[PDB]
Assembly symmetry: D2
Amino acid sequence: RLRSTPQDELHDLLCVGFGPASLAIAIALHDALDPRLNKSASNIHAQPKICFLERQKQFAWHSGMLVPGSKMQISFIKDLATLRDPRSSFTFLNYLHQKGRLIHFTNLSTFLPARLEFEDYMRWCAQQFSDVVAYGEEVVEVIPGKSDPSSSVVDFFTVRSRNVETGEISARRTRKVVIAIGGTAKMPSGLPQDPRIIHSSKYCTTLPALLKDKSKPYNIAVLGSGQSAAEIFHDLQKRYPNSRTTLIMRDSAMRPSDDSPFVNEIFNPERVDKFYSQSAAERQRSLLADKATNYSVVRLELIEEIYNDMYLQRVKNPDETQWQHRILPERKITRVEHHGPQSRMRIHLKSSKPESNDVKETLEVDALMVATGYNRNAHERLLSKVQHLRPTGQDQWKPHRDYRVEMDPSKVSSEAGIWLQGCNERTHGLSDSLLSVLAVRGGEMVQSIFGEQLE
Amino acid sequence: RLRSTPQDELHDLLCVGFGPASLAIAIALHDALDPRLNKSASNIHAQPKICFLERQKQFAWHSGMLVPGSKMQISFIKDLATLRDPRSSFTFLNYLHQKGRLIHFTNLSTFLPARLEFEDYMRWCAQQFSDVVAYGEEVVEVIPGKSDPSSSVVDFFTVRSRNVETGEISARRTRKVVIAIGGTAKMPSGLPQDPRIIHSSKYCTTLPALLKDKSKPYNIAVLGSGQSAAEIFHDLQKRYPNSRTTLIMRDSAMRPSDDSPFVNEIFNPERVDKFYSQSAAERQRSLLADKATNYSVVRLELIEEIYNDMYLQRVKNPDETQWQHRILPERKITRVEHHGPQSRMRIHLKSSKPKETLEVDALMVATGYNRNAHERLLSKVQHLRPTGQDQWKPHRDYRVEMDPSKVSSEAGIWLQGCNERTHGLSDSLLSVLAVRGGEMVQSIFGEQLER
Amino acid sequence: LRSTPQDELHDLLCVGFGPASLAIAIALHDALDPRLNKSASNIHAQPKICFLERQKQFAWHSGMLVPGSKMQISFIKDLATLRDPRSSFTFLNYLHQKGRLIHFTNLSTFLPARLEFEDYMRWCAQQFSDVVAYGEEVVEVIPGKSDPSSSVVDFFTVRSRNVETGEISARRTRKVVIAIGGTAKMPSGLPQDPRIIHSSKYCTTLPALLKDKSKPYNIAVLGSGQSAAEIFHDLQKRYPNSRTTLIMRDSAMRPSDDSPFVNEIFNPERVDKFYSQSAAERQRSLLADKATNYSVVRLELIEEIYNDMYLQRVKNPDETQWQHRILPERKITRVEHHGPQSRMRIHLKSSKPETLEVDALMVATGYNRNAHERLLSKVQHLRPTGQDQWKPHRDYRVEMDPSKVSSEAGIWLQGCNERTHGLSDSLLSVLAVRGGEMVQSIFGEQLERA
Amino acid sequence: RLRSTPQDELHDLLCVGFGPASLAIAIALHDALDPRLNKSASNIHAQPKICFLERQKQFAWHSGMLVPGSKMQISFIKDLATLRDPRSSFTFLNYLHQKGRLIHFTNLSTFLPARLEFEDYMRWCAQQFSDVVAYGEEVVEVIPGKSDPSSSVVDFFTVRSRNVETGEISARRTRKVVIAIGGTAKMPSGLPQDPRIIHSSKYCTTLPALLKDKSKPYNIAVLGSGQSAAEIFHDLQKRYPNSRTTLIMRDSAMRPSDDSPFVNEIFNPERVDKFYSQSAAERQRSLLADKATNYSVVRLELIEEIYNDMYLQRVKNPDETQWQHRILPERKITRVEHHGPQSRMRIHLKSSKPETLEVDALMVATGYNRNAHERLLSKVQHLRPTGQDQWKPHRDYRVEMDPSKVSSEAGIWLQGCNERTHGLSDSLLSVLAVRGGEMVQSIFGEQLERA
Ligand SMILES: Cc1cc2c(cc1C)N(C[C@H](O)[C@H](O)[C@H](O)COP(=O)(O)OP(=O)(O)OC[C@H]1O[C@@H](n3cnc4c(N)ncnc43)[C@H](O)[C@@H]1O)c1[nH]c(=O)[nH]c(=O)c1N2
Ligand SMILES: Cc1cc2c(cc1C)N(C[C@H](O)[C@H](O)[C@H](O)COP(=O)(O)OP(=O)(O)OC[C@H]1O[C@@H](n3cnc4c(N)ncnc43)[C@H](O)[C@@H]1O)c1[nH]c(=O)[nH]c(=O)c1N2
Ligand SMILES: Cc1cc2c(cc1C)N(C[C@H](O)[C@H](O)[C@H](O)COP(=O)(O)OP(=O)(O)OC[C@H]1O[C@@H](n3cnc4c(N)ncnc43)[C@H](O)[C@@H]1O)c1[nH]c(=O)[nH]c(=O)c1N2
Ligand SMILES: Cc1cc2c(cc1C)N(C[C@H](O)[C@H](O)[C@H](O)COP(=O)(O)OP(=O)(O)OC[C@H]1O[C@@H](n3cnc4c(N)ncnc43)[C@H](O)[C@@H]1O)c1[nH]c(=O)[nH]c(=O)c1N2
Ligand SMILES: NCCC[C@H](N)C(=O)O
Ligand SMILES: NCCC[C@H](N)C(=O)O
Ligand SMILES: NCCC[C@H](N)C(=O)O
């Protein structure tokens, strides 16, 4: 439970996006006000005026990548509450207990539930906050607010959102803003725009509408060699059984993701303090050394499955060029021909060896899945009408350790501010975009944003 | 947490033993009284008068088998509370959080903590009941009590215990008794008593006192082929590196324990209802069908290590009879000669099918456990049973049958941990303790807590 | 190995050309190779050998080449390695010849796909095409007396029916090997119907019955061993909108046991120890080791099937609503199948000492290994008087009355001797070593003279 | 069996070293001369005059690192013959069959034999070449020979070795030389030389002579975080149960070695052709991208074991600084005080980003160098093409020589030190079986074809 604020009142906090980062904040505030879990909150009566705006029509966790049988890449103990308080009612185990499913999950013997199940757990959590989440609202800008228009100090912010069904613009006033909008699809700048070129994030939701007949002999290419690329390549061979699929990667091979126990301690919540305090050179060097814990890597078991699928083809035909499904390593796409009335595009491939008697290959494909990752800079556009409130000379938003961005103290009241969530890897460590530290961080955020107010 | 009852007052419940079974009852009672876990408890004034008697000097979980590196045989999710309420403060995960170790345990990636750790967890739990647990008290009998002697109705029980340090006998009066005393060492009937013949349960605590010099080339035999035998045999080779150890088993081979997921559902808490209601013939048949889940089986990984160690010996010497450590299958012990001043006993071996001798400094007897010590403990109330029973018969709720004309309905005796035959293969393990503790709190204190 | 003209007196005739006989062909080849056996340089006389196989080409339980099915035994136990790793008929040399050895090395598995191990044995078998007559089903074995003045049987006539033409062919031999594997075991209570198909004919017969891979068929599977689990699992992929039901009289699928100490019962050198035990001892031993082979599923497939069921529970807590269901501790009491309805009605009762409407029932109830009894009925009078069963010696030669059968003639059994020779007899476990033993038993004296 | 050549004759081939690389060459020549394996070998009555010089007294494979329980890091299929011919009598599987051990190894279900076992397998191979291997001979230089008086062309080489027992210098003449001397111990340039500073390569042989009492509470430090460091650190805690061990590494963590299936194909024999023909810049980039397949990495299972042991210490005491065994990451050694009459050295630590210990010994597990052939060949380096400062092998491992200074019938080959031109597999067992066969063609092809 959290009771709603009338839309027109001045909010204490408005959060943009209701994915796992914002949801853990919602959960942490709930637990902070629960006197059974927090002996102090016995004397507390007033609840902060909180509001969440989410672009999707309901809570959903990367729905375009809910590939049948995909598993989480992280232990369920790192759910949205347990590392902060195992007694919380929002643990994965308590959710299973409520679904009457806990003993059955115990016999699974896995730390890595299906992505479908973990979505249901977080959907189960999120439903308990329906009175403070406005769905179908896409935030478009954040503009400065002044209670006295003749004042030179901004003391609140107006968040504007467009309803995804009507297009109507709504305005909500708040003292503090959290931006937790995840990542945007990153496409190679050389690729043209075309309904047959689909980022991995829209795989489950748009590809079936393009290629309607599940038995047709489509040619489908996949670009990339990380977890998204591997899952799409593996699934397409099951989803379209008569298809010819081609995995295109600029590396020489899929490489295994690293979560060996010592290396994995960089994701511990208490490391965030050490990481933040290092110099920019140390943080950059560290992120590069631990690259294989998260980016451009595939879970070993899935590498092993794809290799076995390829081995079976080799058993049937010693000639790799005749295989139904193929991996073309150390290639890059140099041209995509897509104009004209035909269904298929023509992809031109050259070696990915640095430009420093080469051969060019062509493919005709009905679709190209682009599994080339994500950017986390969409907040720059959302915050562009308040960036003049930054300190003189900053070209980028600067979060402190507590995730609040730096602002000119003469332009912004100390009672107003903006916080960033999920886009702070460079200052806060490889865990920032993941589920890794969300439970603990939600607690930190509730202290940071509401600590004085609750006390 | 739970406040004490004066020793001389009439108790609501007395529990004999403070192992995991009693600890689960204590925890569930705490949780039933916790307004965070039951809003239907914010309006509860009186805490029931509860008492626990434990013979050991502190909480301890088979400390004589705390073999270096030994692991749990069950997922940590089946702890003393989670399957009943994951919000409990007595979960394993919350314990880790209090110890500041939760994130580190996460990187272990295991469902099977070290036995040493799970002991500390339950010990951490047990400390919060220190005001209601009397340690160093060995219960010796349970005797019937009558508030009106002129009556034919037993309406309470007197539990007598001997202090392990002083020998003083104490008497406590209670309306209800729980017996949760675990198992006793099962010894083969043909073996004589000798300080060199030591049951597995006393391995860590007695053997080092006997074989003090860790460098001597002792001959040590081990009898059995279940989990206790496998762990002792493996550990002896590290503990006494120059020893010659011999594993003696009547089966042909160590066999893996079965916790494959469909088979493992017999341990689910909700199976207890189905199992309890089956006939005596069906109950026996299923326990025999599911034997490989618990008795006479070794965790697959431990077998593989032992086999690898033997394989390495074969690499060094192809003649098995010259090996330092040996496994002798399909053998039974027919005689042990032990009378004499000489240090070693002479073990005589025969085939286990329906001359070999070993001279040994010690024999570890890893032959399992019996669970009927309650029969001796309850013999002075045996006349209160319905006429014709030669055994104590627990109902589904674990309360034993008593002649309704001889025992008041407000008094009773419950059994815990010794009911495998009527309640399933999960009765003696950690499997259903969290849910079962909750059930017991309902059965014994439900009416009292509701009013 | 060079062929023998059909009409000549053979030294050895083998009935069946599956893995059991193939191991013999391979072992005889190696016994004659001077690279492997120095003495064979002084042998130019090859024994007169011939193989009769009922299938049109070599094939290894092809009605069960289920997509993704794996071997249940390490590739080291191929058809030659445990006898001689230098043999050209090893699995590793096959991979090397196919140019696949390093790629297989990167698979890091001891358990090849069944498809692959079948191709490995097919590669072996093709090198014996001159002594294998395919499409020939042996129908009887009949005694021969070469000396009209004696009553002593000193050879055998094996007659076979060609499966395509029906012509009956007769071949004379001094010694016979029967290595015809197993026959489908069906529960005695089940009626015959084209919709009731044993697991051995799953891949080959069911597709002809259920042609539309997308139709919402109800398909039941009976049993809980490796075949039941592989079919139950595959049907959910093969007919994705189907409703499948696994019917078992046990309470659960149970894991197969190949832990290292238990598994030593399959070692080649155990056969001597096993054979010499009493009948009661051998019977007790087979019962104690049942979980090594019968009524058991590889753990990984159990875990997989359980995971699929768990996903259904996530989607719907009501098991009775599931697309795919397991009904444990059940038995089939009646099958209603006479009628125009496309579906049969299966009647279920509890198996301790509800109905389904199904388009098909897969019967995964295992195999019998006694078909040799009918094949040998015209020589049964040659057994020692008082024996009601064929008795193999340790060397697999069946006992015969020395006053009725010349010592130069005899009959050997392969694959049907579990009760006398151990759990390894019907499997691949000891075939390479046993191939060697058979060549010594059958050709030892002849190869020495030669 | 290859027959020996008289010591004073002109050899066709002389090999420096008799480790696995040279042994694979010996095996491949044997197989090339076997008419059972190569049909042509029937019409060959001329065995090449071959000789091997090995400094150790008998075949031995990194005996200084035969840590109890250490395992191969490579599938046994990549033994010294199988990838070239599975029918060879020198396969690992055939060795097991000859030792009567094949079925027992099968029940192990592993591709990774114990290093102790794989050592014995290669020793079993090596015994069959005893007539052409001179043990106890340390090669010190290779000198050019001119058989034609007044000529300026080198057409043979003199290999000189010192007897390890007597110190006597022997001279052997050959037209072709193979250098296969493996790697030399790499020590950090800042550390001083002291009997207490011991490279990992001498762990099993030298540390026990230094720290003789296995029960004393030594402080033993280990430097590095690759496979050698991890095995020693792990072993020291078993070998010296009361010691205080400290792992010092400049990385932040031990990282797992990569042999996942697609990545691992860089080790396939046929990749050598692809790698060799790539540009110098492309080869350096590829070697950098695949580093985690071989250098500064630990087998995952071993990392997990070390992490488990540390977790247990955390269970016993939450204060990392009080643990018996400790890991100090992101440190480098800046100073060692060791000139003193006190038994312990003083190690000074600073951050390894761009504290003191007192220890009885420091194990330096800092890897290997492969450039000792430069010193062995220094008296023939004037024969390199003008302008080369380094030895350059062709694809077939023959080093380039000025065609006007060296007869085409003479030459020198390198084995194992050619990673920069031939791929990450060059120094390992990965391609030895195939490569030996290639070497037999390269060195003896014309000679065997004329025969
Ligand atoms: C397919 C896939 C699978 C995983 C992962 C990534 C991907 C692509 N991740 C990493 C992933 O970032 C993480 O699991 C969470 O989604 C991060 O939560 P955030 O709320 O910061 O992002 P996220 O993208 O989840 O949530 C942001 C939300 O904001 C909304 N939004 C965006 N713009 C808006 C606007 N203008 N107005 C209103 N709402 C807006 C979006 O609709 C979305 O709901 C992961 N990590 C891990 O530790 N373990 C794992 O197993 C995985 N699995
Ligand atoms: C070495 C070993 C290891 C395990 C297991 C057994 C053994 C021998 N078990 C099974 C084991 O029975 C179970 O884990 C618990 O110990 C069950 O606890 P109980 O409380 O029923 O008795 P348990 O034996 O624990 O404790 C009963 C207590 O009663 C006391 N007592 C006895 N008589 C008394 C008297 N007259 N007066 C006072 N006190 C008395 C004893 O001192 C003891 O503390 C197990 N199960 C599982 O599910 N997972 C696992 O990993 C294991 N591990
Ligand atoms: C699906 C499946 C999978 C396996 C296994 C069984 C099944 C059903 N087995 C056990 C199996 O029995 C063993 O692998 C071999 O098939 C035994 O070979 P046999 O040659 O003795 O019989 P098998 O059935 O192979 O061969 C007998 C042959 O005789 C022929 N035949 C029969 N009657 C004839 C006649 N009258 N005239 C002419 N020819 C006739 C048949 O056509 C057949 O080819 C196994 N074991 C193991 O160790 N590892 C494993 O992975 C497996 N896998
Ligand atoms: C502890 C350890 C363990 C392994 C490995 C390395 C180390 C340090 N390796 C890599 C290793 O390099 C490989 O196993 C082989 O030993 C390489 O064989 P070489 O014969 O080229 O050198 P190697 O060092 O084996 O042999 C060279 C020989 O030349 C001798 N020698 C040197 N100088 C001489 C001189 N001047 N005169 C005479 N003789 C001289 C030496 O005595 C030695 O015997 C490995 N790789 C892999 O693929 N799998 C694995 O499991 C392992 N395991
Ligand atoms: N002996 C240990 C058995 C534990 C049981 N498999 C369970 O899951 O409860
Ligand atoms: N059903 C297959 C059993 C094979 C047996 N484990 C063996 O190793 O021979
Ligand atoms: N250091 C050992 C590397 C061996 C290599 N992965 C291979 O498979 O050949």
